[PDB]
Amino acid sequence: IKEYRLINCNTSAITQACPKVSFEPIPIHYCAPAGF
Amino acid sequence: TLQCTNYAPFLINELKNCSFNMTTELRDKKQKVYSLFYRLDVVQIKEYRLINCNTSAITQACPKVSFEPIPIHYCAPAGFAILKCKDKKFNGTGPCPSVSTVQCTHGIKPVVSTQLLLNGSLAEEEVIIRSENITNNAKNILVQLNTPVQINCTRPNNNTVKSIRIGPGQAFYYTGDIIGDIRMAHCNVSKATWNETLGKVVKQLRKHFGNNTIIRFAQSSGGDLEVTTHSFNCGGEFFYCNTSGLFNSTWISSNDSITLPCRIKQIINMWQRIGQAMYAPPIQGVIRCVSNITGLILTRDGGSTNSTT
Amino acid sequence: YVSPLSVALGETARISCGRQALGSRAVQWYQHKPGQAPILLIYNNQDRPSGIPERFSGTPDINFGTTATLTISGVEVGDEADYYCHMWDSRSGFSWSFGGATRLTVLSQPKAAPSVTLFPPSSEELQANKATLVCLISDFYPGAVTVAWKADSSPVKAGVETTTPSKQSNNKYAASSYLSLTPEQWKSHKSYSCQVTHEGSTVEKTVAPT
Amino acid sequence: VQLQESGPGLVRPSETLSVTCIVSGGSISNYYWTWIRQSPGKGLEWIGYISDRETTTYNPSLNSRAVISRDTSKNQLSLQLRSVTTADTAIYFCATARRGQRIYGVVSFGEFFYYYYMDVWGKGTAVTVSSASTKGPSVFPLAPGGTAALGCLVKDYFPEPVTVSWNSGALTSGVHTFPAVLQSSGLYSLSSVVTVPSSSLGTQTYICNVNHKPSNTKVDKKVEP
Ligand SMILES: *[C@@H]1O[C@H](CO)[C@@H](O[C@@H]2O[C@H](CO)[C@@H](O[C@@H]3O[C@H](CO[C@H]4O[C@H](CO[C@H]5O[C@H](CO)[C@@H](O)[C@H](O)[C@@H]5O[C@H]5O[C@H](CO)[C@@H](O)[C@H](O)[C@@H]5O)[C@@H](O)[C@H](O[C@H]5O[C@H](CO)[C@@H](O)[C@H](O)[C@@H]5O)[C@@H]4O)[C@@H](O)[C@H](O[C@H]4O[C@H](CO)[C@@H](O)[C@H](O)[C@@H]4O[C@H]4O[C@H](CO)[C@@H](O)[C@H](O)[C@@H]4O[C@H]4O[C@H](CO)[C@@H](O)[C@H](O)[C@@H]4O)[C@@H]3O)[C@H](O)[C@H]2NC(C)=O)[C@H](O)[C@H]1NC(C)=O
Ligand SMILES: *[C@@H]1O[C@H](CO)[C@@H](O[C@@H]2O[C@H](CO)[C@@H](O[C@@H]3O[C@H](CO[C@H]4O[C@H](CO)[C@@H](O)[C@H](O)[C@@H]4O)[C@@H](O)[C@H](O[C@H]4O[C@H](CO)[C@@H](O)[C@H](O)[C@@H]4O[C@H]4O[C@H](CO)[C@@H](O)[C@H](O)[C@@H]4O[C@H]4O[C@H](CO)[C@@H](O)[C@H](O)[C@@H]4O)[C@@H]3O)[C@H](O)[C@H]2NC(C)=O)[C@H](O)[C@H]1NC(C)=O
Ligand SMILES: *[C@@H]1O[C@H](CO)[C@@H](O[C@@H]2O[C@H](CO)[C@@H](O[C@@H]3O[C@H](CO)[C@@H](O)[C@H](O[C@H]4O[C@H](CO)[C@@H](O)[C@H](O)[C@@H]4O[C@H]4O[C@H](CO)[C@@H](O)[C@H](O)[C@@H]4O)[C@@H]3O)[C@H](O)[C@H]2NC(C)=O)[C@H](O)[C@H]1NC(C)=O
Ligand SMILES: *[C@@H]1O[C@H](CO)[C@@H](O[C@@H]2O[C@H](CO)[C@@H](O[C@@H]3O[C@H](CO)[C@@H](O)[C@H](O[C@H]4O[C@H](CO)[C@@H](O)[C@H](O)[C@@H]4O[C@H]4O[C@H](CO)[C@@H](O)[C@H](O)[C@@H]4O)[C@@H]3O)[C@H](O)[C@H]2NC(C)=O)[C@H](O)[C@H]1NC(C)=O
Ligand SMILES: *[C@@H]1O[C@H](CO)[C@@H](O[C@@H]2O[C@H](CO)[C@@H](O[C@@H]3O[C@H](CO)[C@@H](O)[C@H](O[C@H]4O[C@H](CO)[C@@H](O)[C@H](O)[C@@H]4O)[C@@H]3O)[C@H](O)[C@H]2NC(C)=O)[C@H](O)[C@H]1NC(C)=O
Ligand SMILES: *[C@@H]1O[C@H](CO)[C@@H](O[C@@H]2O[C@H](CO)[C@@H](O[C@@H]3O[C@H](CO)[C@@H](O)[C@H](O[C@H]4O[C@H](CO)[C@@H](O)[C@H](O)[C@@H]4O)[C@@H]3O)[C@H](O)[C@H]2NC(C)=O)[C@H](O)[C@H]1NC(C)=O
Ligand SMILES: *[C@@H]1O[C@H](CO)[C@@H](O[C@@H]2O[C@H](CO)[C@@H](O)[C@H](O)[C@H]2NC(C)=O)[C@H](O)[C@H]1NC(C)=O
Ligand SMILES: *[C@@H]1O[C@H](CO)[C@@H](O[C@@H]2O[C@H](CO)[C@@H](O)[C@H](O)[C@H]2NC(C)=O)[C@H](O)[C@H]1NC(C)=O
Ligand SMILES: *[C@@H]1O[C@H](CO)[C@@H](O[C@@H]2O[C@H](CO)[C@@H](O)[C@H](O)[C@H]2NC(C)=O)[C@H](O)[C@H]1NC(C)=O
Ligand SMILES: *[C@@H]1O[C@H](CO)[C@@H](O[C@@H]2O[C@H](CO)[C@@H](O)[C@H](O)[C@H]2NC(C)=O)[C@H](O)[C@H]1NC(C)=O
Ligand SMILES: *[C@@H]1O[C@H](CO)[C@@H](O)[C@H](O)[C@H]1NC(C)=O
Ligand SMILES: *[C@@H]1O[C@H](CO)[C@@H](O)[C@H](O)[C@H]1NC(C)=O
Ligand SMILES: *[C@@H]1O[C@H](CO)[C@@H](O)[C@H](O)[C@H]1NC(C)=O
Ligand SMILES: *[C@@H]1O[C@H](CO)[C@@H](O)[C@H](O)[C@H]1NC(C)=O
């Protein structure tokens, strides 16, 4: 503003990522339906 | 709790200037800010509170969205169909001789309105009276005009808005102090055209009550504030118009435009919704909307003595 | 209360209103000259009474965000005066106050020289056991003057009472100084003098017992 | 229309001041009328007014000490101020007042206001609030470019004002009555001079008419060299 604040608190709200989920990208196949 | 005073130089007229604390974006830190409320939104215990806070929770309408009704077509899926009656003199149920079919209706504007119907479709030929049990008073009466009357509705007050941040990301838009004169919202209706329209309606009305019977018009006298008034939306603001000027007549055997008073509320529960209410955000600048009155909704006072009044 | 304004002669003066109206307004402009009756110059924001010269004008209330102003074109020495702006608007209420006065001074106003007339005590006043020397100073501009009395060659410090200069009906200033003596003091000195210094220049008049 | 004030000119502290205003050349019955004062080192203060219906309204800052009336039978406006103090010393002006309407919107929504303006005024009357009695002025002649100077000393009078005239009309100019001096005694003294032809001297005549209405006193002085 020693006093501080989080960067985000004036721009937007915040939520904590769940610990369990992983951000390790895995191959994904995009499929089109039948007839396409 | 709101600490409020009346405006202070009110010669002949209600809206109140309030001050209050507010949570800022940091949880721990607070701010003292002030806002202007139309006195319908607040009640006392000078200390005040919002009307809604004991009945229900509240949420603020996003500023971006517009409440300006656009035509919507209702469509039926394939294998089904919509039948459309094109009978001009169609009295509200019955066999329709001239019928056409469509997969989708025409553009129907979802105009949220009370008492008088706005920006709608006009009946051709004679004005049309539609009910469900004409001898019954409990069931309302639908009127469709053949000629639309023109109604000009304005909020003259120069409303200024400020933006106070009350939490992370959250931002409340509050009504700043008015700049310039304090004038009340109103609606004008040409007295000539409204007298013609009122004449033509009673002509078609007497078709159901024998022929020189006394047909008078009185004000609404039942129910809550939100129902007794011509409630609608205009530019963003919600108008509650008192319609005493029009329905003060009796029928037997210059411009002079009528003027109608309108109050403004920013906290609203329409369609009898008790639960999550909405705060209509203040609208910057002067408001003026020109609208059509295409229909009406009437009600009897009771079993009448029949050919008496 | 006084708000000073100075304007060069023959140019256009613009006097702002002391108050800015909360709501749509009716403003009146009064001209007040010291010792005379106030004059209505403008009423209803822009309207001029018969006889008021079209030199004065006010700002019309068209609802534009514009302050009440008084315009005087071709400002003359005769426009030196106080100007009050009586402000009526819709959110103030009944306005009892006239507001403060804008004191208008006209300027590059030539530097006229003072005229000085010194009168000895009357024969009657001396028989009445009193004596007063009367120094009259008129027709000067600007209004600042210094008056000193002398007895012979030395300065009298007291017995002297002097009026503050004020503008007369020819737009120039006038003041008077009175030195009261006893008759024996009057006959005591060879001569008394009234010395007036205006704008650095000093002139003097003299009288003697006879 | 013409307005001329009349007054006491001296009022003891804690007494009731009274001033009157005669109107000529227009009917009293059809107009509003008002009082305004000027106190020394202050501005013009609006006291209050009277309507055509003879209803009165007053500035709160007078604290109900003021009463304004009308007497149509004498065409005269009047004012009394009770319980005066030295701050009530002032020149007191009577004026006409016109009502105007400033309308910004709808009449029925009350979207209009009234304002008043004073279009015709009196000269004023000086009224002083002081303990002492009226004191008459001893007047003394002041003896005489081709011109000489001539004058009258008006010494030690109370209170203001003094009128000075010369021969009535004939000596109109060039005659100058100076502002008075307020003595440390609290007495007032002024002087009035006129510029005359040296040749006129000894053949002509000049006297000054000195009026002290508060005294009241009256005198004339023949000035001679
Ligand atoms: C729904 O319907 C509602 C009603 O059905 C409707 O409500 C209406 O709203 C409007 C505004 O939207 C309102 O309009 C206002 O009307 C005011 C009054 O207008 C009338 O009176 C004036 C003045 O007349 C008096 O003075 C003259 C002097 O010459 C005399 O000759 C007259 O006899 C008269 O004196 C009598 O009345 C006095 C009291 O007022 C008494 O004390 C006195 O004893 C006498 O009895 C007339 O001039 C007007 O005529 C003019 O306008 C009409 C149209 O209305 C024209 O046809 C006509 O040709 C003329 O042009 C009229 O009869 C207006 O004063 C007001 O306008 C002023 O205010 C606004 C803002 O507040 C300003 O922006 C504007 O500039 C105007 O200010 C001028 O005047 C003031 C005050 O005098 C000045 O101080 C100011 O500086 C300014 O002067 C400038 O402009 C002048 C021209 O205007 C010019 O001359 C000057 O030189 C200078 O430049 C405003 O228009 C209306 O009243 C409402 N209706 C009702 C019933 O209340 C609503 O809007 C509808 N809703 C919709 C459509 O959505
Ligand atoms: C019956 O039918 C009739 C006929 O349709 C209806 O009458 C119409 O009613 C309309 C809505 O009620 C009304 O529309 C409004 O008109 C305003 C004025 O129009 C003028 O400008 C346009 C160009 O934009 C011209 O073409 C036109 O000729 C006029 O000159 C508009 O300004 C209105 O738009 C604003 O309001 C709507 C909400 O209604 C917003 O969605 C829109 O974004 C605008 O809001 C922005 O601008 C205002 C200006 O003051 C700001 O205050 C506000 O915060 C917004 O600003 C933000 O957004 C902008 C843009 O992203 C951004 O730049 C800025 O920084 C801010 O972030 C609106 O369009 C019609 O005029 C009216 N018809 C006629 C002929 O008068 C009648 O309502 C119907 N009856 C009923 C009961 O509904
Ligand atoms: C919520 O809070 C966060 C953090 O608290 C905000 O993020 C910060 O936002 C501020 C301003 O919004 C920003 O500060 C500017 O950064 C710029 C880029 O680094 C700088 O260029 C800029 O400097 C100019 O402005 C200064 C005054 O603030 C001047 O002192 C300086 O001289 C600069 O001015 C020059 O340049 C301009 C433009 O060319 C010119 O007009 C001038 O004449 C002059 O020549 C500021 O320092 C921070 O960088 C942001 N912080 C971070 C960590 O990114 C966030 O914006 C807030 N949220 C909202 C919605 O506002
Ligand atoms: C949340 O708060 C809001 C606002 O704070 C509440 O809205 C208000 O609700 C109250 C009561 O619920 C209501 O007050 C009544 O309004 C009625 C209609 O206007 C009045 O008729 C009624 O008066 C009767 O009761 C008074 C005592 O309260 C008596 O003094 C008075 O004489 C009346 O009594 C007569 O009539 C009855 C019935 O016929 C009879 O039995 C008696 O013998 C006597 O003859 C109250 O004043 C307010 O009008 C509401 N406010 C607004 C602005 O609408 C809301 O209800 C609260 N929420 C919940 C869930 O309760
Ligand atoms: C509706 O109520 C709100 C309350 O939040 C109100 O906002 C406040 O109004 C008061 C009015 O007194 C403002 O206070 C004034 O502020 C100015 C500028 O700082 C001062 O100069 C003022 O002082 C003068 O007046 C005093 C009166 O007693 C004198 O004693 C003093 O000597 C000065 O002459 C005065 O303190 C205050 O600033 C606002 N608050 C904010 C945050 O703006 C609002 O004005 C009310 N609505 C209306 C139409 O009045
Ligand atoms: C409701 O009230 C608000 C007051 O909060 C009012 O907003 C003001 O409106 C005027 C326009 O009428 C704005 O004035 C302009 O502002 C812009 C941006 O600052 C300037 O560029 C403009 O300058 C022009 O005009 C000048 C006139 O002297 C010229 O000299 C110049 O060269 C430009 O041509 C002009 O000053 C004003 O800024 C706003 N104020 C705010 C705080 O927004 C609004 O008008 C009212 N609503 C309605 C519908 O009237
Ligand atoms: C509209 O008018 C028609 C008349 O053509 C009404 O139809 C009759 O209604 C009565 C009762 O009111 C029935 O007993 C008849 O059988 C109906 N006649 C026919 C020919 O169908 C119709 O009820 C009216 N609608 C309303 C809402 O009043
Ligand atoms: C309100 O009513 C007016 C007529 O009073 C409508 O204006 C007409 O609109 C139709 C389109 O439906 C045009 O064909 C006409 O030419 C218009 N009339 C005139 C005189 O030009 C107006 O559309 C109606 N507003 C609505 C329904 O919002
Ligand atoms: C509603 O507003 C419209 C337009 O602002 C008004 O139409 C005006 O009517 C007058 C005659 O009464 C005409 O002189 C104008 O030319 C019309 N304006 C336009 C733009 O065409 C209408 O009269 C208003 N309705 C009421 C009840 O006052
Ligand atoms: C709408 O306006 C009418 C004015 O016509 C109001 O009616 C008055 O109501 C009071 C009681 O509240 C009665 O004593 C009066 O006799 C009524 N006036 C007239 C002229 O009959 C009415 O209250 C207003 N409605 C609302 C909801 O404010
Ligand atoms: C804001 O909170 C403080 C308590 O710290 C309170 O004294 C004050 O009255 C509040 N503000 C208003 C407008 O009531
Ligand atoms: C509807 O009207 C009929 C006609 O006589 C009447 O018998 C019936 O009771 C009414 N229904 C209701 C619900 O009032
Ligand atoms: C009522 O008036 C209409 C229109 O003139 C007429 O057709 C009808 O016969 C009248 N009804 C009676 C019962 O007289
Ligand atoms: C409206 O009703 C009131 C109350 O009886 C009446 O005084 C007034 O004349 C009515 N207005 C009209 C236009 O009939």
Domain that holds residue C189: 109-210
Secondary structure (3-state) at B232: strand
Chains in contact with chain D (at least 3 beta-carbon pairs closer than 8 A): B, C
Distance B19 CA to ligand 11 centre (A): 9
Does the CB atom of residue B193 touch ligand 8 within 6 A?
A: no
Tell me the CB-side half-sphere exposure of residue B187, using CA atoms within 13 A.
29
Closest to C106 measured CA to CA, from C82, C76, C83: C76
Q: Which of C74, C108, C142 lies at the terminal end of a domain, its last residue? A: C108
| CA distance linking residue A9 with residue D10, whole number of Å | 75
Asked if the peptide bond before residue B180 counts as cis, ω within 30 degrees of 0, the response is no
Closest to C25 measured CA to CA, from B35, D63, D101, B162: D101
Q: Are D198 and D148 in contact (CB under 8 A)?
A: yes
Closest to B216 measured CA to CA, from B202, B237, B228, B232: B202
Contacts 24+ apart (CB under 8 A), D66-69: D66/D35, D68/D33, D68/D34, D68/D35
Owner of token pair 């737009």: C171
Owner of token pair 């060299």: D225
Same domain, residue pair C76 and C129: no
Secondary structure (3-state) at D84: coil
Same domain, residue pair C56 and C143: no
Residue C108 tokens read as: 């590059």
Closest to B26 (Cβ–Cβ): which among A9, A11, A14?
Answer: A9
Chains in contact with chain A (at least 3 beta-carbon pairs closer than 8 A): B
Residue A19 tokens read as: 């610990």
Secondary structure (3-state) at B226: helix
| CA distance linking residue D207 with residue C193, whole number of Å | 27
Asked if the C-beta of B183 comes within 8 angstroms of chain D's C-beta atoms, the answer is: yes
| Ligand located closest to B20 CA | 11
Q: Which of C108, C128, C153 lies at the terminal end of a domain, its last residue? A: C108
Closest to B136 measured CA to CA, from B300, B306, B308: B300
Distance B14 CA to ligand 4 centre (A): 21
Same domain, residue pair C9 and C99: yes
| CA distance linking residue D205 with residue C151, whole number of Å | 34
Secondary structure (3-state) at B259: strand
Same domain, residue pair C103 and C143: no
Same domain, residue pair C118 and C152: yes
Residue C52 tokens read as: 């008021």
CB contact under 8 A, C22 and B11: no
| CA distance linking residue C129 with residue D140, whole number of Å | 13
Q: Are B170 and B59 in contact (CB under 8 A)?
A: no
Q: Which residues of A touch B26 (CB under 8 A)?
A: 5, 9
Q: What is the residue-wise DSSP string for B52-76?
A: GGGT--EEEPPSS-------B--BP
Owner of token pair 């008084």: C70
Q: What is the residue-wise DSSP string for C84-153?
A: EEEEE-TTT-S-------EEEEEES---PPPEEEEEPPPHHHHHTT-EEEEEEEEEESSS--EEEEEETT
Tell me the CB-side half-sphere exposure of residue A10, using CA atoms within 13 A.
7
Q: Give the CA distances from residue B249 to residues B141, B144, B214, B235, C155, in Å, rounded to whole numbers and listed in that order.
A: 18, 20, 11, 32, 97
Domains of chain D: 1-131 (2.60.40.10), 132-225 (2.60.40.10)
Q: Where is C185: in which H helix or E strand?
A: helix C183-188
In eight-state DSSP terms, residue D35 is E
Does the CB atom of residue B3 touch ligand 11 within 6 A?
A: yes
Residue C39 tokens read as: 């004059």
| CA distance linking residue B303 with residue C84, whole number of Å | 70
In eight-state DSSP terms, residue D86 is G
Farthest CA pair distance, chain C: 76
| CA distance linking residue A13 with residue B253, whole number of Å | 70
Q: Give the CA distances from residue C148 to residues B231, C195, D178, in Å, rounded to whole numbers and listed in that order.
A: 85, 5, 19
User: What sign does the dihedral C88-D105-B13-B269 (CA atoms) show?
Assistant: negative
Residue B216 tokens read as: 């008078």
Q: Which residues contact B200 (CB under 8 A, 6 or more apart)?
A: B126, B127, B146, B147
Query: Residue C192 CA to chain centroid, in angstroms?
Result: 30
| CA distance linking residue D63 with residue D80, whole number of Å | 13
Asked if the C-beta of B69 comes within 8 angstroms of chain D's C-beta atoms, the answer is: no
Same domain, residue pair C116 and C160: yes
Same domain, residue pair C104 and C4: yes
Phi, psi dihedral angles at C118 (to 5 degrees): -110, 125
Q: Which of C84, C108, C132 lies at the terminal end of a domain, its last residue? A: C108
Closest to B69 measured CA to CA, from B107, B111, B106: B111
Does the CB atom of residue C62 touch ligand 1 within 6 A?
A: yes
Closest to C62 measured CA to CA, from B4, B260, D104: D104
Closest to C37 (Cβ–Cβ): which among D119, D123, D151?
Answer: D123
Q: What is the resolution of this structure in A?
A: 4.5
* Domain count along chain C: 2
Same domain, residue pair C32 and C60: yes
Looking up residue C71, the CATH number of its domain turns out to be 2.60.40.10
Q: Are D69 and D78 in contact (CB under 8 A)?
A: yes
Same domain, residue pair C103 and C124: no
| CA distance linking residue D13 with residue D84, whole number of Å | 5
| CA distance linking residue D125 with residue D9, whole number of Å | 8
Q: Are C74 and C55 in contact (CB under 8 A)?
A: yes
Same domain, residue pair C73 and C47: yes
Q: Which residues contact B126 (CB under 8 A, 6 or more apart)?
A: B88, B89, B146, B200, B204
Closest to C180 measured CA to CA, from D195, D191, D210, D217: D191
b/e sequence D146-164, b meaning 16+ C-beta within 10 Å? eebbbbbbbbbbbbebbeb
Q: After which residues is chain B broken (C to N over 2.5 A)?
A: 13, 45, 253
| CA distance linking residue B276 with residue D220, whole number of Å | 96
Asked if the C-beta of D43 comes within 8 angstroms of chain B's C-beta atoms, the answer is: no
Q: Which residues contact D200 (CB under 8 A, 6 or more apart)?
A: none
In one letter, which amino acid is B216? Answer: R
Same domain, residue pair C153 and C198: yes
Does the CB atom of residue B26 touch ligand 5 within 6 A?
A: no
Secondary structure (3-state) at B111: coil
Q: Are C28 and C70 in contact (CB under 8 A)?
A: no
Closest to D79 measured CA to CA, from D67, D91, D71: D67
3+ Cβ–Cβ pairs closer than 8 Å linking A and D: no
Same domain, residue pair C199 and C101: no
Q: Which residue from B289, B290, B291, B293 has its CB within 8 A of the most atoms of ligand 2, so it is best to mutate?
A: B289
In one letter, which amino acid is B148? Answer: P
Q: Which residues contact B72 (CB under 8 A, 6 or more apart)?
A: B107, B108, B109, B110
User: What sign does the dihedral B170-B68-B196-B204 (CA atoms) show?
Assistant: negative
Question: Pairing between strand B58-60 and B277-279?
Answer: parallel
CB contact under 8 A, C37 and D93: yes
Answer left, alpha or beta for residue B198, where phi above 0 means left and psi between -120 and 50 means alpha. alpha
Question: Pairing between strand D10-11 and D125-129?
Answer: parallel
3+ Cβ–Cβ pairs closer than 8 Å linking D and B: yes
